[PDB]
Design a protein around this ligand. Sequence first.
Ligand SMILES: [Zn+2]
Length: 461
Amino acid sequence: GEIQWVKPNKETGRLNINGPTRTKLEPSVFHDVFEGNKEPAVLHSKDPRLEVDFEQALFSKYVGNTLYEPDEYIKEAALHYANQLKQLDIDTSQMSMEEACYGTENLEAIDLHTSAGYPYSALGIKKRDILDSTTRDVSKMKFYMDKYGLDLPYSTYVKDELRSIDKIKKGKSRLIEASSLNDSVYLRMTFGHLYETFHANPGTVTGSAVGCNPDTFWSKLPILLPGSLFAFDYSGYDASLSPVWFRALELVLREIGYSEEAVSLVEGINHTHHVYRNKTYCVLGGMPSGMSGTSIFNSMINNIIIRALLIKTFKGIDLDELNMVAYGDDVLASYPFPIDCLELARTGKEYGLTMTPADKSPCFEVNWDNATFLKRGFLPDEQFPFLIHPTMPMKEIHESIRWTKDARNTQDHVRSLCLLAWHNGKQEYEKFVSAIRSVPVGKALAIPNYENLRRNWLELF
RNA sequence: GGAGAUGAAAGUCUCCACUAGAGAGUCG
RNA sequence: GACUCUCU
Ligand SMILES: [Zn+2]
């Protein structure tokens, strides 16, 4: 991904889009009870904590582009994946505007407590003024579709969230790319059925973990990924995507039988325009965070990437022996023979991808005893060993509990953290629960009982 | 909670990141 | 079926 040009909104006619510049985050009653090192991200140009210029750090994630056209490896990789998807029999027909706006069994409705994007978020128009869950009215939507057209620019906001100390000093806040409801509606109308399929089939045919429930999915993974595991991390996956991968995605979409009209929509996301405050900018490459389909598409693209990386790096790779699962950039994959990722990373750089080792180390072996996916590890149950615990590390659960965007929901926050923490064992969970109790607010909380968490987990099976 | 508008005030009104997934809670 | 929270 690479920024092509920046022009003032005076020159491009774009309305100003401003976001919030002060964090909803404030220290919690458990702030000094647990340890942690994170703080709210830098949201403002003149934050004291800053050690560099803010915006230059904000947009450094667009590292640039390498390949624009698929080579022979990326073609064969698209084709292998594309063929693997055919057994799913995806409905490539256009879904109805009622279904796209208001949902199906396998596709939630358009979120209505959330912004409608350019240009509504500047005209004071909310989604709620155009859509109505109870009416299922597609009347006002089709009017505004033909008022503002399609390909409206993405509204850029800084994400309000906890980041490590470094990323605060160095200015490395995340940006969200808020789509226009007009594009979300169309994207949902063109690929909604593919969405349905992908949500209805987390696993190694889709290669998509989207829709999975870690409590039960974790026990299938060691059967779905047999043999030697490999994994790795990307530095800036979304923004590093060179235009070639959108070309690759187009290869997969056609092979599974999408209309050319449908496939044309992919350039609409390889090449995007954006408004940040009072400037308009152009981005060639890079997956916009906030568009209808980002996760699935990043997940598809990843499937193309691993296949290509494999067959351009090693000789005699049988892609039929690859199993893999992607959640956007997150990956777990297995092959009958160990795959050296030091060499994949080398192939990766050729393709504009920066890959680091998975254990956050500077050397690249991955096994179940140390593999992680969706931030959780894999821990076989001490009683029934074929049942696998996802283990969210207690370090990350400590980071969350120390802050809050509204204390009115402390009770709710702590329960959700306990549903995550208990998989680390009785001894760790009671260490957690008792330190919550160590504070006057903690003694007023309803806290789930470990044996009830365990018992509820086992009835799942 | 923060910001604004208005107003002596009371109040009133307006704003406070996108796409998805998962789990939970509350109510019907 | 709504509304909300926390995670990823
Ligand atoms: Zn452009």
